[PDB]
């Protein structure tokens, strides 16, 4: 595990992480898989898009197919046919979003969203799973507030105690461990949580508990507060969100890594992410269009197909339309991040950010 | 142009030269309906080795309609496919519709999209396929289900419609195939074949079979038909292109085949392998570290285990369907490649015996 910042432009950082299965230049957007797959994409598609790292959740993997089947494959990378790095989410947001869970300091009991059976999860079990999966970056198991101030405070303190326990149970080789800062929209709590986890010591630091509904201005202010107490020589990872204008605002505040289901999910609804903003392929303004999805894109979709043809596929309910937009949208995210990196190297990052924020209102 | 390079019994090794490419035969054509083979890109099709695909035209005529495909300067451009396309004239789709009015002028039916009354006849069909620019067009036919009187009427109508199709077929760089009808009645099959060859087409399809009659009659009617079809032109069995039937039909002189079977059953979780069907949803795959087909070199077999594919289906990931669709088309194109190699090497009966055993 090594991270270096090669150039800074204000708070924006050009860096590189060396992980067990590959180097990752930052800032980086990670495509998200839940069930050991990025929906509608093959690993080839992801490699051709230029993705250097993907995110896997494991809350669902722990349930299905389970640790034992992934051990038979000798890890998640082999199971899903992806030979580059993987970061695994520890599932805090998913678990604590479930109705009628029983939480205490030992852990959480919940009903499986798959089959309804009662499951117990805690830091020691989460580490166990992630060690078995073999991801290049593992996350500590947090108490993510589902919450009033007193609740957020309880979950933040519990997050510290679980961070210690996760770190203690993290006995492996070739895997980094990131801590997760909590604190909701309360700067005192955010500052305290950052100082707490920073005192424990991790390979990198995630900012948890944001882009879950709070106002955007609060998302940005809380990132600034946290980033003030996070070491400059480690990666900063904002969890969730992943809209182009948010990612640019956050890069400008010192964040290095990002993930979202946004680009894959909106592709399936028929929306492309282009350099001109969102393009709704279901709109009738595409029905007779001979233009590609994006004039400035080199992906398979933009090389071969017209807006008219893709509109048609969505009109008829062809899943191929969803596939073609998922390929385009992931290409676009990786290409956005490469543009960001280039702009930081060139000192033109403010020019880029203005153009992105303009079209992603 | 079409040339038989070798025969082994009645099995023919041949080559068609079409506007967008050469096609070696015997050949299986993957089938699309809405200007796509479901879940596949043109790149997947190319990498499978598909030298030609089939497009239905019934639904394309309604959506997006002919004018929008014309904006693209034709169907190959519209769907991003640069190799040959055979277009079906829609006779089986009209056969599959409830409550149509058919006479000598044409067929009226209610739109699958709209409920509105749609009228289709040979002239309209030719105009659509001409606009699409497919490499092979089919005549508009009347496909029956039925009493000899009823089958004979549809077969007679098919002749009159074949004449009208040929007269409306004013184009260039497109072949036109006639369609033999006649149900399960040998005399009607012989007469239909004689009538269509008297007109003269670029190829001859065997229609109205594998739609419910006994297998032994599918095979016998194919023999009767092929007896009256020119050896220097392609023979096309329309539909029903499962592995064991394809092999039985190659052995009786048929060159071209199509079916939605491989793509459709992939979506239900079934792989076509050299050992027969494999149901990936079956619980015995849950821990299997084997590929879908140890004999196969496709993307899917090279990279994933039966455990992972099983899991994708377990979790409702459409990726599971995509991967089995890639494999199943690879399997069908490879099966046909082996058929061709076996005719050349005189080992066709060993291939046949294996296919028949596992696709029983
Ligand atoms: Cl338009
Ligand atoms: Cl589909
Ligand atoms: Zn593109
Ligand atoms: Zn395969």
Swiss-Prot record, chain A:
Its cofactor is Zn(2+). Residues 240-246, 264-268 are annotated as: RNA binding. Binds 1 zinc ion per subunit. GO terms for cellular component: cytoplasm; cytosol. It is an enzyme of class 2 (transferase). It catalyses: 7-aminomethyl-7-carbaguanine + guanosine(34) in tRNA = 7-aminomethyl-7-carbaguanosine(34) in tRNA + guanine. Pfam families: TGT. It comes from the Bacteria. GO terms for molecular function: metal ion binding; tRNA-guanosine(34) queuine transglycosylase activity. The keyword Transferase applies. Substrate binds at residues 89-93, 142, 182, 209. Zn(2+) binds at residues 297, 299, 302, 328. The keyword Protein transport does not apply. Catalyzes the base-exchange of a guanine (G) residue with the queuine precursor 7-aminomethyl-7-deazaguanine (PreQ1) at position 34 (anticodon wobble position) in tRNAs with GU(N) anticodons (tRNA-Asp, -Asn, -His and -Tyr). Catalysis occurs through a double-displacement mechanism. The nucleophile active site attacks the C1' of nucleotide 34 to detach the guanine base from the RNA, forming a covalent enzyme-RNA intermediate. The proton acceptor active site deprotonates the incoming PreQ1, allowing a nucleophilic attack on the C1' of the ribose to form the product. This is Queuine tRNA-ribosyltransferase. It comes from Thermotoga maritima (strain ATCC 43589 / DSM 3109 / JCM 10099 / NBRC 100826 / MSB8). The lineage of its organism: Bacteria, Thermotogati, Thermotogota, Thermotogae, Thermotogales.
């Amino acid at each position: 595990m090594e991270f270096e910042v090669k150039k800074t432009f204000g708070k924006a950082r050009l860096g590189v992480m060396k992980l067990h299965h590959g180097a990752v230049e930052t800032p980086v957007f990670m495509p998200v898989g839940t069930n050991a797959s990025v929906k509608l994409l093959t690993p080839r598609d992801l490699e051709e898009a230029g993705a250097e790292i993907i995110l896997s959740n494991t809350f669902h993997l722990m349930l299905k197919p389970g640790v034992e089947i992934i051990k038979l494959h000798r890890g998640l990378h082999n199971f899903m046919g992806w030979k580059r790095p993987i970061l695994t989410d520890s599932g805090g947001f998913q678990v604590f979003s479930l109705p009628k869970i029983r939480i205490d300091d030992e852990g959480v009991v919940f009903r499986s969203p798959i089959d309804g059976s009662k499951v117990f999860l805690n830091p020691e079990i989460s580490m166990e799973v992630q060690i078995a999966l073999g991801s290049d970056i593992c996350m500590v198991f947090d108490h993510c507030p589902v919450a009033d101030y007193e609740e957020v405070k309880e979950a933040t303190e519990r997050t510290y105690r679980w961070a210690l326990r996760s770190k203690k149970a993290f006995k492996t080789e070739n895997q980094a461990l990131f801590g997760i800062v909590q604190g909701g929209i309360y700067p005192d709590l955010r500052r305290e949580s950052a100082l707490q986890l920073t005192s424990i010591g991790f390979d990198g630091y995630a900012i948890g508990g944001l882009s879950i509904g709070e106002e955007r201005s609060l998302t940005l202010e809380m990132t600034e507060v946290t980033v003030e107490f996070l070491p400059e020589d480690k990666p900063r990872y904002f969890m969730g969100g992943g809209s182009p204008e948010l990612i640019l605002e956050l890069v400008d505040r010192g964040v290095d890594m990002f993930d979202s289901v946004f680009p894959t999910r909106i592709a399936r609804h028929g929306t492309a992410l282009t350099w001109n903003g969102k393009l709704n392929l279901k709109a009738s303004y595409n029905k007779r269009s001979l233009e590609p999805v994006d004039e400035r894109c080199g992906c398979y979709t933009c090389k071969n197909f017209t807006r008219s043809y893709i509109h048609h596929l969505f009109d008829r309910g062809e899943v191929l339309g969803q596939i073609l937009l998922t390929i385009h949208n992931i290409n676009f995210m990786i290409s956005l991040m490469k543009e960001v990196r280039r702009s930081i190297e060139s000192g033109t990052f403010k020019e880029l950010k203005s153009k992105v924020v303009e079209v992603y209102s």
